[PDB]
Design a binder for this molecule. Structure first.
Ligand code: NA
Ligand code: ZN
Length: 357
């Protein structure tokens, strides 16, 4: 339906490689000990950051929209806040990899209606092979994100030389209590590092979100550990599609996501990159000076093309967070379909708190 990208070039060589893109869900930055949250919510990622020099933690990445399907239309394609409809007239990150000769895979624990024409389904079909692990009635069903590990191990065993693996997690999405098993509520009844003025209902919701962060860390670190245990050639990118306000912002009474009434904790996302030893040897690259760049998830496809070593008509290396030519632009938020409703993310208040900006 769409024409391939013009003047397409692959400069990464022709050796076999496996590239992984982990799409997290609702995980905000300010609630992870990896970014300064005083509760130990991400211990396995913390230790991995201490002992592994190839894990690169990005500290100033925010999303553009706080709703799953509305952000993925921008993150996975050339669309952004100024041109939101480019997911219909330009190729996607999955089309680009197939044009590069990759056998693409889509693994997911989010309920996907394969008989229905949702936009997530259309994205997941653009791959060669799909693994839907959460076919299921609905809310309360209890399908945890470790469902992806066994098929992830199976895709690693596929003998295709060039592989792109996309792992879509339920992450830390509502309802928080159903993201982790019942006997792993480490923060149940805990009241330390809790904002003031919470009732028993708001307190249990707050602690369930940190319990869900704990489990999410286990899943992301396990994907990195299993990938590393295959001694591969390639890298892995983890990002959350958007954040989630959970009584973080004063007066500590708000929970959820609202584009028309935005707070920072809804837009701050983790952004991790793990490069294999073989890939770093063949593509030496220093990322230590990039970790503090102010970056929007809306331009993710340019960072990916850069890392994958791809160039084409439309490739903008100034919007790649790992490129030497990176130039900071305005990190737009707000509904791109309303009349002049775009505002700078930096104008939002409470940027000084730990894990914001
Ligand atoms: Na985009
Ligand atoms: Zn989402």
């Amino acid at each position: 339906a769409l024409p391939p990208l013009a003047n397409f070039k692959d400069e990464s060589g022709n050796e076999p490689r496996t590239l992984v893109l982990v799409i997290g869900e609702s995980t905000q930055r300010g609630r992870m000990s990896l970014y300064g949250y005083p509760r130990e919510t991400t211990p396995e990622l913390d230790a991995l950051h201490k002992t592994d020099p190839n894990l690169t933690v990005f500290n100033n990445v925010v999303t553009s929209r706080p709703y799953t399907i509305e952000i993925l239309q921008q993150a996975l394609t050339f669309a952004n806040e100024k041109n939101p409809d480019l997911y219909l007239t330009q190729p996607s990150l999955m089309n680009m990899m197939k044009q590069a000769g990759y056998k693409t895979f889509w693994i997911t624990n989010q309920q996907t209606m394969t008989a229905r024409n949702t936009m997530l389904t259309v994205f997941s079909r653009q791959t060669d092979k799909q693994y839907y692990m959460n076919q299921q009635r609905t809310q309360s069903a209890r399908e945890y994100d470790t469902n992806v590990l066994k098929p992830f191990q199976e895709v690693l065993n596929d003998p295709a030389p060039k592989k792109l693996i996309i792992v879509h997690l339920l992450g830390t999405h509502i309802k928080y209590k159903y993201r982790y098993p019942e006997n792993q509520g480490k923060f149940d009844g805990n009241t330390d590092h809790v904002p003031p003025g919470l009732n028993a209902e708001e307190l249990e919701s707050y602690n369930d979100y940190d319990n869900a962060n704990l489990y999410n860390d286990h899943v992301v670190a396990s994907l990195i550990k299993d990938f590393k245990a295959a001694n591969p050639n390639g890298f892995l990118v983890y990002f959350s599609d958007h954040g989630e306000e959970v009584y973080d912002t004063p007066p500590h009474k708000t929970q959820g996501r609202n584009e028309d009434n935005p707070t920072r904790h809804m837009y701050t996302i983790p952004f991790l990159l793990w490069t294999s030893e073989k890939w770093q040897a063949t593509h030496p690259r220093d990322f230590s000076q990039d970790v503090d760049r102010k970056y929007s998830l809306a331009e993710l496809i340019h960072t990916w093309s850069d890392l994958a070593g791809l160039s084409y008509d439309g490739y903008d290396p100034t919007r790649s967070v790992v490129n030497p030519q990176f130039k900071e632009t305005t990190r737009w938020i707000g509904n791109p379909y309303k009349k002049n409703a775009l505002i700078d993310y930096d104008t939002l208040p409470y940027g000084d708190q730990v894990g914001n900006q």
